[PDB]
Design an enzyme around this catalytic site. Structure first.
Site, PDB file in Angstrom:
ATOM      1  N   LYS A 182      85.840   8.921 -38.578  1.00  0.00           N
ATOM      2  CA  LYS A 182      86.352   9.741 -37.664  1.00  0.00           C
ATOM      3  C   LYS A 182      85.482  10.838 -36.883  1.00  0.00           C
ATOM      4  O   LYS A 182      84.414  10.891 -37.343  1.00  0.00           O
ATOM      5  CB  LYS A 182      87.781  10.228 -38.248  1.00  0.00           C
ATOM      6  CG  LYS A 182      88.877   9.563 -37.847  1.00  0.00           C
ATOM      7  CD  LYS A 182      89.271   9.406 -36.451  1.00  0.00           C
ATOM      8  CE  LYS A 182      89.708  10.778 -35.944  1.00  0.00           C
ATOM      9  NZ  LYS A 182      90.260  10.659 -34.575  1.00  0.00           N
ATOM     10  N   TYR A 183      86.028  11.488 -36.043  1.00  0.00           N
ATOM     11  CA  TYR A 183      85.299  12.494 -35.412  1.00  0.00           C
ATOM     12  C   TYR A 183      85.881  13.889 -35.761  1.00  0.00           C
ATOM     13  O   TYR A 183      84.876  14.737 -35.942  1.00  0.00           O
ATOM     14  CB  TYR A 183      85.321  12.504 -33.827  1.00  0.00           C
ATOM     15  CG  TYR A 183      84.876  13.494 -32.971  1.00  0.00           C
ATOM     16  CD1 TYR A 183      83.337  13.177 -32.898  1.00  0.00           C
ATOM     17  CD2 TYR A 183      85.207  14.389 -32.289  1.00  0.00           C
ATOM     18  CE1 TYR A 183      82.589  14.085 -32.088  1.00  0.00           C
ATOM     19  CE2 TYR A 183      84.494  15.385 -31.656  1.00  0.00           C
ATOM     20  CZ  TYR A 183      83.131  15.244 -31.605  1.00  0.00           C
ATOM     21  OH  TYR A 183      82.321  16.064 -30.947  1.00  0.00           O
ATOM     22  N   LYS A 188      92.387  16.517 -42.145  1.00  0.00           N
ATOM     23  CA  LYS A 188      91.680  15.181 -42.348  1.00  0.00           C
ATOM     24  C   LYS A 188      90.608  15.275 -43.017  1.00  0.00           C
ATOM     25  O   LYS A 188      89.897  16.249 -43.122  1.00  0.00           O
ATOM     26  CB  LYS A 188      91.412  14.532 -40.879  1.00  0.00           C
ATOM     27  CG  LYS A 188      91.879  13.133 -40.922  1.00  0.00           C
ATOM     28  CD  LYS A 188      91.629  12.699 -39.466  1.00  0.00           C
ATOM     29  CE  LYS A 188      92.226  13.301 -38.493  1.00  0.00           C
ATOM     30  NZ  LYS A 188      91.608  12.934 -36.973  1.00  0.00           N
TER      31      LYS A 188
END
EC number: 3.6.4.-
Lengths: 490, 185
Positions: free
Chosen positions: A1-2, A130
């Site tokens: 992910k970013y 996250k």
DNA sequence: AAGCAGTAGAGCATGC
DNA sequence: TGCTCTACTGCTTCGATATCG
DNA sequence: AAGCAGTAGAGCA
DNA sequence: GCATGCTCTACTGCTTCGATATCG
């Protein structure tokens, strides 16, 4: 992910003997571990300042956590690295910090087992973010904690596999009983020594991965292919000077205006124009006219034919070269054409030529695409990923003009002596480690200001040579090569 | 940039010139003299409606230009003297004053350059890195003019005199006029 | 550029 | 005729700022 | 925003 | 029969964040 951050819990063992000096007079493991944790926080507060970091001690006399176990005590909680938190952490140095630790919570109790890992799991769970990487650093020396019971051994080896089931990875940084690795014991179940990497090497770095442009390549007029134009080198520089009030030390929020047409009042952008002056006459245009008069295309990569990789010298460049990659997001099936074109250009050593317009209004620029092939090994040396490099090119008013008219040759004796000089000075260049001195000095200056360990560490100029070693490495032929053909001779 | 431009127009419908004796130096009229180029120069370029051709001679306007350079140059030190010629080389010439005038340009240090028509030797529009001859464009007047400018330029420089001629079609996508002007660095 | 929250143009369902 | 000081001055370069994907 | 050589008009042989 | 009531993707736009261009 970013937008996925990563976490680290530092688990510290203080049961019976690491709080002791272990009958030594050299180095105590408790202050060693506190030094390593403080070093990790100092590196990551300027390297990667959004990750999650925490400290937990186990085996202490007191107990405080969210569910009230016995002999488990935490000190900080999962957040960004903070100056207040390292100034709370650094109180445990020396024997005086050891006794302060003793009166703060006291060392020595019946240390339990895997329910400490349960408390680490409850720290990992309750966070509304996250999470990308979940690792647990264990600072301990005992390599057999089950000297009296098998039930706690079984619960340890079961709860560790249970934390492994939902993807949590612990890795104990091993301590030393005589000073080196000698406790050759069997943790071949729990885990998946060298602490200079936790000490030294991450004083300056940043973390990202982005794309910078998503464009289309047009072969003829009607057969187009989507590419993303990534960056590889970007010339990192120091963060900006946030403005502040002198007394109360809060942000200022300045505001700008334009006014005063000898009437007071106010003005507006609709009441003004742009202008230029040439000797006498002035030319008056508008902001939209200034914006419009630089237009040639729409943003993209127009093909213009293929070229052999000889004429473009590597002496010609103007910008940090980017790196294009194909993707099956806009147009489905572009990986096929890019792999085929890459294979053909790779075997026949031919480079492509393109006209390049980055965004919605920029005058065009001629770029040349040169392919490159991947490498890896058992150590996974991914130093080259496959794809095309975008060498920029000058046009006509970038190549300047030198005086160009001086020519005197040289006698064939000095070339062998200089060959001997450069062969005595011959070594590998590098892979890394030529760090920026002014940025590094600013980094250490900002380090020793929010901690009041006053003494500002002088930055190690790694780029400097060492002439007192290079004279002796070269040998006494300096004056020989001087008086060979170029004496000073007044 | 602080420069000075002077334009000579030969072959117009009027002979006003600092020196014109008889049919020698006929229909030579300078447009604008040695001046810092303001917008009036561009106005005079836009006042160029007429060819108006009664052509007499062209290898003498260089002598007139150098003589007005000598007349005006009093304290105004120029590091160089660049003279361009724009023609299509289709009228007739006068091969009498060539050797002495080349010797005087050799003794007065003039850098001359020549611009050529479309035909050096499908849709040939303006310039497209393409050919030059439409089908075949050269007659005897272009033959004699091309060979005398080639011999004059090789005697002026050497090999680069053959390179000191340039066509109209490819000089738009190059800056070959912008040579031997700028002080370097 | 990446992510993410929101609302609107529309589609089925029921009424004096 | 010969030497010297200095009074700016173009030619640079970090550093602050406005815009865009 | 700020320092480094160029080039002439007086101060001094 | 035109008027009012649930509902489903999905288009625009807010927010951060890094690069680029411009001016002093």
């Amino acid at each position: 992910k970013y937008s996925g951050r990563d976490s680290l819990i530092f688990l510290v063992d203080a049961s019976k003997a690491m709080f002791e000096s272990q009958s030594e007079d050299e180095l105590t493991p408790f202050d060693m571990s506190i030094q390593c944790i403080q070093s990790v926080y100092i590196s990551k507060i300027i390297s990667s300042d959004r990750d999650l970091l925490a400290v937990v001690f186990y085996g202490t006399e007191k107990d405080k956590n969210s569910v009230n176990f016995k002999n488990i005590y935490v000190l900080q909680e999962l957040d960004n690295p903070g100056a207040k938190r390292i100034l709370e952490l650094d109180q445990f140095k020396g024997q005086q910090g050891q006794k302060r630790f003793q009166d703060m919570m006291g060392h020595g109790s019946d240390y339990s087992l895997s329910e400490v890992l349960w408390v680490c799991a409850n720290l990992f769970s309750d966070v509304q973010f996250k999470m990308s990487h979940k690792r647990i650093m264990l600072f301990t020396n005992e390599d057999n904690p089950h000297g009296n019971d098998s039930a706690k051994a079984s619960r340890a080896r079961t709860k560790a596999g249970d934390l492994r089931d939902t993807g949590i990875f612990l890795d104990l940084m091993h301590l030393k009983k005589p000073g080196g690795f000698d406790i050759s014991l069997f943790y071949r179940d729990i885990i998946s020594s060298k602490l200079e990497d936790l000490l030294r090497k991450v004083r300056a770095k940043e973390t990202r991965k982005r794309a910078l442009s998503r464009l289309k390549l047009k072969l003829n007029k009607d057969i187009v292919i989507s590419v993303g134009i990534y960056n590889l080198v970007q010339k990192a520089l120091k963060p900006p000077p946030i403005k502040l009030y002198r007394e109360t030390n809060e942000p200022v929020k300045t505001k700008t205006r334009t006014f005063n047409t000898s009437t007071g009042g106010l003005l507006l952008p609709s009441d003004t124009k742009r202008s230029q002056i040439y000797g006498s006459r002035q030319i008056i245009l508008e902001k939209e006219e200034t914006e419009e008069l630089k237009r040639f295309d729409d943003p993209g990569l127009m093909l213009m034919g293929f070229k052999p990789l000889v004429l473009l010298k590597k002496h010609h460049y103007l910008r940090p070269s980017l790196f294009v990659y194909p993707e099956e997001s806009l147009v489905i099936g572009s990986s096929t054409l890019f792999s085929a074109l890459l294979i053909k250009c790779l075997e026949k050593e031919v480079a492509a030529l393109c006209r390049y317009t980055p965004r919605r209004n920029i005058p065009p620029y001629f770029v040349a695409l040169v392919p490159q092939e991947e490498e890896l090994d058992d150590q996974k040396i991914q130093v080259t990923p496959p794809g095309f490099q975008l060498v920029f090119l000058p046009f006509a008013d970038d190549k300047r003009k030198m005086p160009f008219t001086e020519k005197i040759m040289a006698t064939p004796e000095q070339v062998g002596k200089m060959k001997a000089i450069v062969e005595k000075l011959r070594f590998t260049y590098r892979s890394d480690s030529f760090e920026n001195p002014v940025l590094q000095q600013h980094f250490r200056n900002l380090e020793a200001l929010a901690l009041d360990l006053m003494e500002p560490e002088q930055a190690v100029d790694l780029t400097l040579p060492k002439v007192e070693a290079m004279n002796k490495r070269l040998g006494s032929l300096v004056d020989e090569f001087k008086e060979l053909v170029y004496p000073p001779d007044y | 940039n602080k420069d000075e431009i002077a334009l000579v127009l030969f072959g117009t419908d009027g002979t006003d010139n600092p020196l014109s004796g008889g049919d020698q130096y006929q229909n030579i009229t300078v447009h604008r003299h040695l001046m810092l180029p303001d917008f009036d120069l561009l106005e005079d370029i836009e006042s160029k409606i007429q060819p108006g051709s009664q052509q007499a001679d062209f290898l003498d306007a260089l002598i007139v230009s150098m003589d007005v350079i000598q007349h005006e140059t009093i304290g105004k030190k120029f590091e160089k003297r660049h003279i361009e010629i724009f023609t299509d080389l289709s009228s007739r010439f006068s091969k009498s004053q060539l050797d002495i005038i080349i010797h005087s340009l050799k003794k007065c240090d003039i850098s001359l350059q020549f611009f050529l028509p479309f035909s050096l030797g499908g849709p040939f529009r303006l310039g497209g890195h393409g050919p030059s001859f439409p089908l075949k464009g050269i007659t005897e007047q272009q033959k004699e003019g091309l060979e005398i400018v080639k011999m004059v330029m090789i005697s002026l420089e050497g090999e680069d005199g053959l390179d000191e001629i340039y066509s109209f079609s490819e000089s738009l996508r190059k800056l070959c006029v912008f040579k031997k002007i700028e002080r370097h660095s």
